[PDB]
Design a protein around this ligand. Structure first.
Ligand SMILES: *Cc1c(COP(=O)(O)O)cnc(C)c1O
Ligand SMILES: *Cc1c(COP(=O)(O)O)cnc(C)c1O
Ligand SMILES: *Cc1c(COP(=O)(O)O)cnc(C)c1O
Ligand SMILES: *Cc1c(COP(=O)(O)O)cnc(C)c1O
Lengths: 400, 400, 400, 400
């Protein structure tokens, strides 16, 4: 299970002061550059760009492809923060999001036209935890000269999945999650594979083909070759729109990256064990996790993930007797179970070293019985023991 | 000079640990909140929002007003980065920037239609340091139901000018400059006056009057009344597009604010004394600074600024013999003066406590003789002596 | 009023990235070195050393001179924490502190013996704010081959007093106070004049004259000449005993240093004005401030202080009716006034930009009527008004 | 391998903002408080104190036991910096360090007298990695009423050893090393088991028995019972002597602790494998690591360590021809091996996630051939391959 990734996450971008300085300066960012190269190296990309958040990394990524009058094609299985960004905020920019339920390859193609500037996927989709069929979707997007953008947040900076290996062109990360690993720092990363042939599609992507008025009349394809996309995103979009990552955030996230494979491995082993334990528990109706045999999209998971199946799972708790008669929400077995955990923390992030839970129906396909768990790196027996005592307290004196 | 500003910059938002904790967390920003409240109070606004840069402040401020198909109307006296942002970047979003030379208010009205969603000004415009006629431009924009957005970066956090006092609706700052004060930290702020009556223009500004699909069906005008703009910018745009200020940035900027009035006063007084001296120098051909009586906009400057005239001036250095015959740039007198400076630092920021100079034709009204100076809070005799010794070097073996 | 000091506090040690990096590194401090060189220049010293606290700066400074069996001679007008340090902690190290009273030099001579390794002064002593007669005490210490160590904390980093200019050998600072300026960061500085002739006293100070076994047999006097003291303190004491300043602290203190003269000037000016105003107040029995003619050591203050008289003052509030008939402490006017302050903050620090108060008799001569103010840089009229409204409340229904 | 240590390292001290705020304040440290409770829980201690560095932790730890005229008794197998501290700087304090070669209990006893205030040991001693016989040495120390102080730095925060379970009284750490884990942050920890019965030695330890003049006449043994040591060290020594830990360092170290078990396990496993590999190399003359069967102390090591044998090893490289005629020491083989390493970094720290090497003859038992290696958590094959390619280069064109 140890591999070269362990070396890369400590050395890529550090060429020759051993720790990298916080260049807290406006004027002459080396700290962000190390981070960028390291995540590039871990993803199997050519270059990367750091921005102030996951949401910013997704925003710039798409705005570097699509302009007013354009469209993008996305899975409907969206991290809920991405869904509003797409359907609502992007619409105010004249960018139309088109959603393909299920991920039959020919369903994608039926909404393609010449104004389609990206296909957008998530490595592990919220909230059915389906892994996309990267090869089929990439073949069909590339056939029509459309680049593929993948949110690989749940791939933990490349540890569980490197979608560039399966043909993805652009990868985005909420580094806020597993890359940082400690719930201290918000950040995003955009990674360019450097393999999408912009030159073949000068009319679809004029931003790389035509002199850039905003950058000394540079033709990005001529001046930067295969890095045209990421250079344009840096020199025009980041410059003009300004979601830059603070060097202190760059520093903290570099600290996390140094232990990424160790943390992620443990997150995955703990999540698979917790998911298996929940599934056999008499308190639980169902569990959703990509590493369970019972998972529908397990075939893709097995093919495209490695070293495990991600840090996150969902499960439903069985009802208290008199389930639907109870007029009060908070008194339902899901919210109760969350309120009685002592180890797990009730809050909305994922990718902390600490185990985190949320019961969606009660604050933020959301049923009342549903608990989402970002599984931490605590001792698995204490994690399980925490759920068990919560179940016990909630179903107090009353078989499961 | 001392005023209640001195008290506010230390106490607004810390009404109730004596220093403000850096809450480097993702999950449950309070440092950001103190900064926002403090800049709001100094500018006389109702509320504010901190974001990752000045560029982002301007981007979100406009994107909270204008959607694709809309237009905005702007002075053409723009900060370099605002120009490309407006001309090139906003165009990709379907927002048309209409530029209007001079500060005749009839030039503004000329280019209004009912899809005009903002008028945009700079308190002290670049590169000629023109202060606009706030009263007249506001009057005419408000007549047509159009809100006025003012980049008050050169007003130093409200110290040299509070555009809201003259009817501005929205104020944006590069907090990177004088607010921070030390060249360490990038950051932006948006300040809402809360005096623009969104309710009276339900169709020009649908984002405040129609149910927000991306925010639980809320009608911002109904739920948040006079704070509809700023709440929308926060809960929709900031959330979806993601240019968040890091808490370490919030923290350092808060430290700068606490001395803003002390610093800005000294920047003002030093700039004026440098300007007057350059105006008597045999080595100078012209000087541009709003507090000089010879400046074309000296009247507006006197009426809308107070406590001084800002920290930035430009001047032209006398030509050396063979100036147009000279083919090589670096031997032009401007580049040579900048090269021989010892105290001043050659870089592009403004608003550092250190004095900074740039000869924009020899790096980035961009004529060959032109030196721009952001005048620092060094002892004035040391700043002057620095220019003097360089002039002497550059022009040696001649007659001043 | 402005002087070269304003240039020095921005430029010294920044030799040739505009801001100084945070080198958060164990291995290869540069940030620290800038702070050191800058405070040395501000104090007219040859070199300096940064350490984790004012208490650490005092400890190492003394342990750089005195060993077990030795004594030092100190004013008894000690900041509270220095007294315990000296009388109690130093004793466990076999260093005996001898406390001399008043300013008279002859009393100094009487307790001097061949094992006296230092004389210790404070620039403004607690809590009577008496300034020492530097010239007489230095003359009589130097006659006996004894160096003078001065805690110049209340000197505000050289702004109000540079004791080295009156012959002091070694100056220490709690940089926690005026040097940082914001109550955020704890730190200490030791400054060496480089002017004490260690070579003339090889027996009194063997640590500079005998091969140092702890440092490869170096004789500090030969290898480092006039810097023997500070090099010995760095390379032996800091190394072995370990009170090192973290580079983040170094960074924040440097930011404060950049406005030192502006803050200190305002603190001094506001304290004098407050002091005068309290004196004429009929709620006030007495006022102690070095810049009042009423002060007993006024003449030392005017000879050795410049640009003002420090940031700190004490005063007595007149008794309420039933003065000695109150056996409840908290009903006395002193405590009542601090509780009804709205702008001032009640805590034990000095040197914050904000106004700080304490009634030491009701938590930390220390009489029942006494309030200690560290006067901030708020608008003076707001500070005064805060006292008045407090007075009026406490004395409501009763004459001044 | 995974255990409860994994939960404790995440949760101890964070009872109920999910991330710990950085309280950068001088006035009212909770960040340090979390780190102290955590390291105490990981060591099996009652309480702990954070200080500016490991050197400071060792200094205050001893100064809280021994006063002028006292002695302590110490292994001779000391980390370099400790030896100078003990032999030289402590002597200036009137504390005599009595060094006891070897690890026979009885040799400790022969230098005990009634002024012996500590026995000081190291978990893995330098420079030959000997583990002391804890049980035997604690029994003879405690028989004479002497507390045992253990530098457990190389125990990695309790992961490889918890000396308190073997009867140690006080444990110190350089948290600079594995606790922190990234070479970013300097710090120390003192841990008190709360088991040493101070009340039975009121004259050997008057600091806990006699009213404390430096702290309100308190008798630590009465007011604080079994926590008298750690409270006296905090409220008197830390307060007067001032080696405070900055909250930024607290925060960074807390982040490191959250991955301690995962890092330390990989360090231990990587060192053992590198050790074994070195043992099959034709370029190596000897290897020293506690986990090898050939190590002199292998039995103590097996008894008192667990989960591995620590992260550091040393070895000696064969000479190149003409050792003795070489007059440039950078042309010797140990130096050349270090110079040709690509992955390993040449510097003095240990306990970084990166592999570090030093050949101490060429910089800081120190012989020509010695390389010390702090083995990092890179992929072991990369680490081995680095040494191999280095040997291949240095000894190119030769017999092996
Ligand atoms: C958290 C998250 C995001 C948004 O990231 P931020 O850094 O919080 O802006 C987007 N993608 C995935 C799948 C996420 O989990
Ligand atoms: C610097 C500047 C900007 C841009 O702000 P950043 O914080 O550098 O993104 C905006 N307008 C003015 C006038 C500024 O000087
Ligand atoms: C605050 C103070 C000290 C102690 O400094 P710390 O940085 O608080 O350890 C010493 N001397 C003076 C006069 C003080 O004001
Ligand atoms: C590094 C170290 C120390 C000294 O700690 P610092 O944090 O460098 O002051 C002492 N003991 C051990 C064994 C060491 O490894």
């Amino acid at each position: 299970m140890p591999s070269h990734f362990d070396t890369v996450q400590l050395h890529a971008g550090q060429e020759n002061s051993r720790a990298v300085p916080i260049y807290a300066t406006t004027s002459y960012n080396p700290t962000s550059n190390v981070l960028e190269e390291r995540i590039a190296a871990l993803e199997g990309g050519a270059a990367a760009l750091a921005v102030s958040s996951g949401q910013a990394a997704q925003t710039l990524a798409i705005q570097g492809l699509a302009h007013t009058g354009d469209n993008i094609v996305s899975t409907s299985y969206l991290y809920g923060g991405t869904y509003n960004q797409f359907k609502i905020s992007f619409k105010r920019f004249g960018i139309e999001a088109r959603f393909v339920e299920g991920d039959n390859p020919e369903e994608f193609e039926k909404v393609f036209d010449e104004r389609t500037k990206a296909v957008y996927l998530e490595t592990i989709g919220n909230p059915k935890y389906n892994v996309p069929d990267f090869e089929k979707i990439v073949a069909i997007a590339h056939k029509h000269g459309i680049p593929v953008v993948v949110d690989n947040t749940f791939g933990a900076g490349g540890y569980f999945c490197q979608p560039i290996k399966y043909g993805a062109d652009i990868v985005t990360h909420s580094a806020t999650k597993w890359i940082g690993g400690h719930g201290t720092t918000i950040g995003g990363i955009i990674v360019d594979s450097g393999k999408f042939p912009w030159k073949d599609y000068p009319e679809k992507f004029p931003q790389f083909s035509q002199p850039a008025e905003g950058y000394h009349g540079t033709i990005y394809n001529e001046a930067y070759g295969n890095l045209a996309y990421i250079v344009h995103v840096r020199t025009e979009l980041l410059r003009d729109l300004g979601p830059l990552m603070n060097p202190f955030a760059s520093f903290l996230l570099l600290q996390g990256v140094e232990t990424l494979s160790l943390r992620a491995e443990r997150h995955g082993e703990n999540a698979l064990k917790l998911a298996k334990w929940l599934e056999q528990s008499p308190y639980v109706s169902w569990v959703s996790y990509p590493g369970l045999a019972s998972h529908s999209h397990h075939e893709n998971a097995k093919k495209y993930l490695s070293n495990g199946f991600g840090g996150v799972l969902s499960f439903g708790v069985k009802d208290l007797p008199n389930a639907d008669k109870e007029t009060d929400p908070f008194k339902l077995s899901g919210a109760q179970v969350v309120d009685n955990l002592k180890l797990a923390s009730n809050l909305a992030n994922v990718g902390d070293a600490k185990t985190l839970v949320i019961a969606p129906y009660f604050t933020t396909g959301v049923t009342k019985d549903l608990i989402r768990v970002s599984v931490g790196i605590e001792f698995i027996d204490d994690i399980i023991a925490d759920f068990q005592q919560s179940f016990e307290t909630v179903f107090a004196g009353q078989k499961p």
